[PDB]
Structures are given as C-alpha cells and as structure tokens.
Amino acid sequence: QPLDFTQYAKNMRKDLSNQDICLEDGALNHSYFLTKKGQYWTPLNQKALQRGIELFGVGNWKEINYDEFSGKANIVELELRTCMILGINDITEYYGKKISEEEQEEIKKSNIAKGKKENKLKDNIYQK
Amino acid sequence: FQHNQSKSLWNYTLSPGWREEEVKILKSALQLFGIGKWKKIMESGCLPGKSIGQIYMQTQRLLGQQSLGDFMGLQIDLEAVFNQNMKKQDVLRKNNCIINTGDNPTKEERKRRIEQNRKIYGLSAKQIAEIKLPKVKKHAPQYMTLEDIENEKFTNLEILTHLYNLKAEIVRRLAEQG
Amino acid sequence: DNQLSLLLKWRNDKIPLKSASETDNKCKVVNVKNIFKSDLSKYGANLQALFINALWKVKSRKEKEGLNINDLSNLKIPLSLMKNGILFIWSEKEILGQIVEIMEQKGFTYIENFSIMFLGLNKCLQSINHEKSIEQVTQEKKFVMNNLDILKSTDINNLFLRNNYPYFKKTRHTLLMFRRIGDKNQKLELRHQRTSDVVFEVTDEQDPSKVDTMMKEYVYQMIETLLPKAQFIPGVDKHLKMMELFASTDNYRPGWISVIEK
Amino acid sequence: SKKGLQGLLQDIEKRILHYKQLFFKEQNEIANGKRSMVPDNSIPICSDVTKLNFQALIDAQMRHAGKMFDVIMMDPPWQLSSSQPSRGVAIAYDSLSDEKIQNMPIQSLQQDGFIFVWAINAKYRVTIKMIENWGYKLVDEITWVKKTVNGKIAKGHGFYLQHAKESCLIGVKGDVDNGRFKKNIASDVIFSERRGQSQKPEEIYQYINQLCPNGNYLEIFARRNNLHDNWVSIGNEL
DNA sequence: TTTCTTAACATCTTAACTTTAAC
DNA sequence: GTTAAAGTTAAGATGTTAAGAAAG
C-alpha cells in the first residue's frame, strides 16, 4: 500500500522538528514561515508579555524585557504586541494598569466593540 | 520583495548608490588609511552603508584603473592618477577604467610599482596629518533618510523599530536643546 | 524569445582555420600506432596546453568504436613534457570520476570544466518546417543557422537534444581541464574569464560526442585565448607549446603538435 | 530647524501609524489562518549538521516511512568567499570545512538510492571523492545553466572560464533496477533562471519527481525556498 | 621555523538603475 | 510629456597571495 504522505509528514514533524516549525497537532506552522528568521513571536513570548503586562508596568518595557523576557526582545516589538492585545493603536492611555491579568480579554473585547460601533474595526484594532 | 525568505539569498548593499558627499569622504579616507585597507576604512567608520565591494569599485573609478594592487597599503593623491589614466590613449577601457590588456601582474613588479607610486604620487606627512575624517557619533541610528528607512527589504517590524529609534533621537535632541 | 541568435551567434563568427601543412614549420604531425602507450616526450617538450581529443567507447554510445578509459592509465605525461600547464580532455557520464581519478594519479589537479549544450538538429528542422552524411549535416546546420529568427518563437527546452542514457537523458558534452604546477616559482600566463564555461551548439543525434569542424574551432579558440604565451609565434619560439592527441588527419591546427592514431 | 523639524515629526508619526496599520493587518491575517508558501507536506529541520542527532532522523524515518530516503539532495556551504567580499560573489552563510561535510552519516542514512550533491568548481573533485567514500557510484551529472531574465546565459566569474553553470553530481548506491526508480528520464541540463544567491532551480525537484515518483527525499542543506512536498529539509536558517 | 586564517588581490558579463538626447 | 538610448553600478556560488595570529 502506498504511504499516506500527509500523515507521514505530520508524524515526522511531530517527532523530529522544532516547536516553532510544527504544532501540537503536527500541522505546519505557517506563522513561523511568514516571518523573518529570528523575528518570530512564539506563543510563549505572548504568554510572557501577557504576564508582564500586569506583573510589571505597561509602558516600562525595559523592566519587562530584562526580567520577564531574556533581555533580547525589541521594545517596539513589545509595545506593538500589547497594542495587538489591547485592541488599540495607542497604549499611551493605558499606561501602567497593574491590577489583574484576567480582564485583558475584557478590554480587548471592549475596544473591538467600540471599533465596531464607531466603524473603527481596522483588522481587529480600534483606531485612536 | 519577499521578506519571508532566508537572509543568505538576495545580498544587498543597504545604501544603493554613491553620492557626492560619500565620494568626497572616500577620497579623504583613501588618503589617510591608504588604498586597499578596506577593513581599516570600515572599522573606524566613515561609510554608512557602503560594502567593501562598493568601496573597491569606487576606488577603481577614482584612479581610472582596476590595477589597485600597485597602490596596496599606500596613500597617494587620487586626482593625479586619474589625470594620468585619462591622458594615455593606447589603452582599452570599460566604464572609464583602464584594463591591463597585456601580461598578468607579477610579485616583483608589484613591489617595484608600489615603490614607484610612493615616490611619484605619494603625499608628505603634513598632508597625511592634515586630513580629518567626519567623526560620526556612535549612538546614531539611520538618521532622517525617509526614503532609506522605508525600504522594501525591511519588514514592517524593522521599519517601525527604526522609526521609533529615530523618533527617540529627535526626542533626545529636543531634551538637550530644551 | 529564446535568444537563440545569441547562444548560437559564435557559429556566425568563428571561422575554421585552414591547416598549415606538414611542409611548413607552423605545425608538427606525429604518427603513432596508439597514443596511450607511446612515449610522448620525443614529440614535444615544455608543453602548456594538452588537448586529448579522445572518443570514449562508453556503453551509452551504440558501439561507435571509441577508446577504453582503462587504457588512459597507461599514458605517460612526465614533467619533461608538461611542467606547468593545462590538460583538456573529453569526458562522459560514467567515466567522469575515472578521468578525474586518473588525472589526480598522473600529477594533475582539476581546475574547470567546459560544457557544450546540445540542440537537436532534427527538432530544430521540424520546428522550422512546421544515416546522414557529414556534408548534409553541415548543410542543415547552415540552414538552421540562417533561419533562426523563425526559430525564436520555440522554447529552448523543446529544442534540446535528449539522447538515450540509463539515468538522465544526455544533452551535453563535457571538456574537463586539469592543471600541472611542477614548480610554483615559474608562473603560467593566462587570460582569465575570457569566455564562458557553457556554450550552445546544434548537433546530430547519431553521435554528439564527436564534435565536428566549426565546433572544435570554438574549443581551440578557448584554449589559445586561455593560454596566450602557448601560441607559436614564428621566429621567436624554438619549439611548439601546444599539443593535441587524437587529431584529424586532414585538419592540422597551425600551431599545435598533432598526434594521429594510425 | 524648528518648523521643518515639526513637519518631520508629523511625517514620522504618520508613517508610524501607516506601518503600524500594515503590521496589524499582516498579523491579523497570520492569526486568521494565512497559508504560507511552503507546502503542507514538508519537514523543515532548523539544526546545525555538526550537532544534529541524525539517529533521530533515521529512527523516525523507519518508524513512519518504513524505508530510508530514496534521494538525498545536498548543496553544501562550501568555503568560497566571505559575507563581506571585496570583488565578487557575496556568500552570506556559514562555510563548512570539507571534513565536516565528509563526517555526515550519509552512508548510514541510505540503503538504495541517489545522491544529488551540488558542487562548485573549487570543490568538484572533493565532491566526487565524497560520493566515492560514501559508498556511492557517481554515474550522472546535471548541469544547471543559469539564465538571465531576458533569456541569455547568466554568466558569473571565474579563474579559467567565466562560470555560468552549476554541477549537481548524481550517484547511485544499491538496488535501482526495481520498479521504484524510473530510468531514461528528464535531461542532464537545466537551462533555468538564476533567482537568488545559491538558489537552485525548481526544475531539479521535478527531475527527482521524474526519477523516483512518490518517494521519500531528504535535503541536507536547505533554505526556506527548498521546502517541497515529501521532502525532509535540514538547515540552520529553516 | 611551520602552518592557518583573513583580507585583498582583476583579467568579465549582464540586468537594473540612472542619466540624457530627441520627437 | 513621453521614449529610446547610452553611462553606471552591483551582483554573480574565482584561485591566489601577501600579512600576520599562532604553534615551534
């Protein structure tokens, strides 16, 4: 019987490829291949940034980069990524919340609803 | 341009072409470090973006010939060599560069011509000590150059990082001024 | 579209060179029973360019009465013959590693290879319209070179000559080059990069290994352009510095030591 | 320079907003399932060959495919020039010594198949030797003739002749005469466009598809353009 | 004293880019 | 205001060799 190439590829990538190249299910991670080498935002990086948003101060990316990250991440990268989380293009109004991690999705949904009502969806980021 | 591909392919020069100021800085720099010391030209830093190949070809264009080995580790005046290469008529050139259409170079002829060019076109110690290269600050990103920081080879992330760095530079400049 | 007027342009420029005859001193003719077991030191010395025009009896050629690759190890190229120079040889697919290994055993070192890419004469003629004697092949070559603009609308890949071979169909011939140093103090003069390592040529499908006239001229001109001091200038050089093995009995190159198998 | 500086700051903020919106659109596309150019059935390995555990590759290939690879494509990072050249080619990747390319367990990775190792003119002889001492019989050579976008020959530079082609040496190891491998196919010439530094033609892959249809292949030195279906690819920038 | 790495060395072609004369 | 027609530049998977870092 001929070998199923999709299943064979899934098994090979799950067994012996990197965590960024493959996924938990074994499907190919297109996100790693649509970004430059080294400039990839792993889910671990996003989880670390989400931890540092309310573990540390929003805006003080020196402390978040040195402590929560390994000190090898761009400050502009971190600011842009938390802009993605907050759903807004200006995190200046949200400087230093530091209350709890369990409502970041809540303010994201609030910004999404505001953009939908004010016709400022703009690829899931409310324009301010 | 496709930014998804690997960095090994599509080698570029960042800075595309040679300007008047850049060629004047190269003329000044070849007279202090010497022709051929491209590592020492770039290491001190006066060519923001030019590769070794660009500086090599620009030196060839400056002297009017591609026989750069006659000026290896040697500081001379660029104008006289260009004048003497433009003066002679029984030569064949492409891109205004004189080509050795005769025999291949030899090791002894190299030393003899190096000594001869040092004697003829060489500069004194006063002219060597007179030249001053533009001292660029080492805490400066790609300042201004809105047509060179908006490069297709860069991603959106890299372009935005450059823009934020430059914006912080004007912020620091206004803080110093104010 | 296919730019065949440029890859085949050399056929309109490289004129074949008339032989200088044995009576004149511009060329030397050497007749031996077989070349690979002949002491070639008496036929020349201080050589610079050796061109073994060997046709190999490979299994791909359909019994064309060539040369065994095992007999080349019997060749004797001493330091007296060539001290610092370049050897040019014809190589096939299944004996390429054999040639390289035997040359490395001789004292030579691989430097470069020069490929002739083959365009089918029959395919080109078929695209123009829609056993062959050598004069008919030459006439058809002239016809296809004259009416090449009409051939500009056909893709190159549909004009390539794909000949029988067990693994990948043959479409090229290869001329390997090897270099002998001897003593690094004496340097062999060269004109580098003066012609490309790949050329395009229309050939017949019967035996593309045997390169005809007006194509051996391209290889000759590449050899003389690569080695300028290897040319025989009459009156100021004593001995010929260029030598061909397995040369034609009618075309003696003016400036070469031709060795004929007879 | 104050009013001009204010205008420059306003233009910088406008470009910041524009590129921020572009980045947001790109990453929203990525989050909402943006298919990349590499096909689904590819195995990209981002590892250094001197430190890569090839035994993992062999064990998983036996566990999943049931047979070793039928074709190995190699285009090694030869020592030719540096990343900052003075005169010519500008090879922007880490060179490997010939001993390191020799030390790969290629003989322990294949049982019957084809090596497709690319070579340069300086490393042609050592490529033949590498094929020889890997237990293989060099039998074929495919010349990729580089083509300009207009249709000419993309002539490069050399020391004896102007290099305008690349040689991929193909060797066999064992049983090929069985029905898996097709004989007398394709051609030894790839007249195709030069589309990047050390960028091999796409057509060679189809030639492999014409040689061993529906087979397992491995690319030992591969970049992000070398991923294909049914191809295991290894590299340091994958 | 011997060898190993880096930099710099020329002899070439073609497309892309830039500049310029002409309708 | 375009247009086609030269200059110009970088890019290309060269081998070789003088000049030291490094082991004697």
Ligand SMILES: C[S@@+](CC[C@H](N)C(=O)[O-])C[C@H]1O[C@@H](n2cnc3c(N)ncnc32)[C@H](O)[C@@H]1O
């Ligand atoms: C010549 S490139 C392959 C290019 C490919 N043929 C194409 O068509 O794009 C070989 C790659 O091997 C990678 N490489 C270099 N050194 C390596 C090492 N030590 N281990 C693993 N991969 C390495 C580099 O990324 C280099 O670009």
